[PDB]
Structure formats: structure tokens, C-alpha cells
Amino acid sequence: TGETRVPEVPSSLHVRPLVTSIVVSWTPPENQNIVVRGYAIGYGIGSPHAQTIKVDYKQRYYTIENLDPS
């Protein structure tokens, strides 16, 4: 539909930390004029630059597995 501009900032983001995993939940941006192909989860200790997981636009929640305890 709309690829003339870069996608807008997502509306919400919610994390849930566990022993070795983190349950991530989100909601797409308010603007629908600009088409969105998917979501890119960026995690890591101290900085989010460590690892990147790319998912489809239909996905609304994702549990980041294999993490350090504390």
C-alpha cells in the first residue's frame, strides 16, 4: 500500500522476565497508511545490539529463549 515513507514508531511494548527467557508483547503503530512487513526484536545484556530476531507482521508476542540467569 504505502512504501513512500519509513514505518511509524510502534504503540506499545511489554516484557516479562523469567529464569532463562523473556516474554515480549507488542502492538502495531497507530498509522495504517504506511504498510508494515514485520517486527524486529533486538535484545542483549546492557545494550540491545547483541542479537536480532525478525518476525512477520501478524505476530504480536514472542518469548526470547536461551538467556543468562540474573
Binding site: 545484556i45 546492557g46 545494550s47 545490539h49
Partner: protein
């Protein structure tokens, strides 16, 4: 960079187009730019360049001190090189941050 307010900094990152520097340093300001206190050093020769010990382990006695390492200084990658400084990395009492005012002051920068 001026934030104009006290922020509890978790990280300071830089993504490079050119190769990463042989010597780089991160500085912070408690006041709004008057005096500067070092945050982290990056060099091949920490001794000769920044007068700090090379690959120094984080001391419990002074966690409010900037540390120097040769990590993230490599010329490769010549493009897309990243340097991300974790403010609470290696700090022994970082686990009990909520009760540690020493590290609470360390993360603070304007």
C-alpha cells in the same frame, strides 16, 4: 551531547562507517557541562594513551572509576564496527543496584 537532565545511563553505543578508532574515550558530566569525569576508555595502549591499566578488572573498592580495555578496538570490520559501553558491566555490586548508591551515582550523567 547535552541531555539537559540527570539520566541513569545503561549504555553508550557507536556504529561506525569508517574503521573503529585505535583510541576512543567516553566522558560524562554531573553538572550541566562544567566539569568532566571519564566513563570508559578504549585503546591498544591504555598505559601510553589514557594513563590507565590495560584489561583492568573491576574493583569493588572503586566501581565509580572508568576502566580501559583493548576490546572493540580491532580495525576489522573496516565498516559497520560497533562499540557499546555497558555502564554496569563487570561492577561487583551491580546485582544489588537498588541498594547501591555508589553505582546509582555512576550511571548518572547530564
Amino acid at each position: 551531547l547535552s541531555l539537559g537532565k540527570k539520566f541513569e545511563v545503561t549504555y553508550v553505543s557507536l556504529q561506525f562507517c569508517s574503521p573503529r578508532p585505535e583510541s576512543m574515550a567516553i566522558y560524562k558530566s554531573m553538572d550541566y557541562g562544567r566539569t568532566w569525569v571519564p566513563f570508559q576508555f578504549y585503546s591498544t595502549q591504555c598505559r601510553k594513551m589514557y594513563n590507565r591499566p590495560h584489561r583492568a578488572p573491576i574493583t569493588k573498592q572503586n566501581e565509580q572509576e572508568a576502566v580501559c580495555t583493548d576490546s572493540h578496538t580491532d580495525m576489522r570490520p573496516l565498516s559497520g564496527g560497533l562499540i557499546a559501553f555497558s555502564t554496569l558491566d563487570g561492577r561487583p555490586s551491580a546485582h544489588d543496584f537498588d541498594n547501591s548508591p555508589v553505582l546509582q551515582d555512576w550511571v548518572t550523567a547530564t
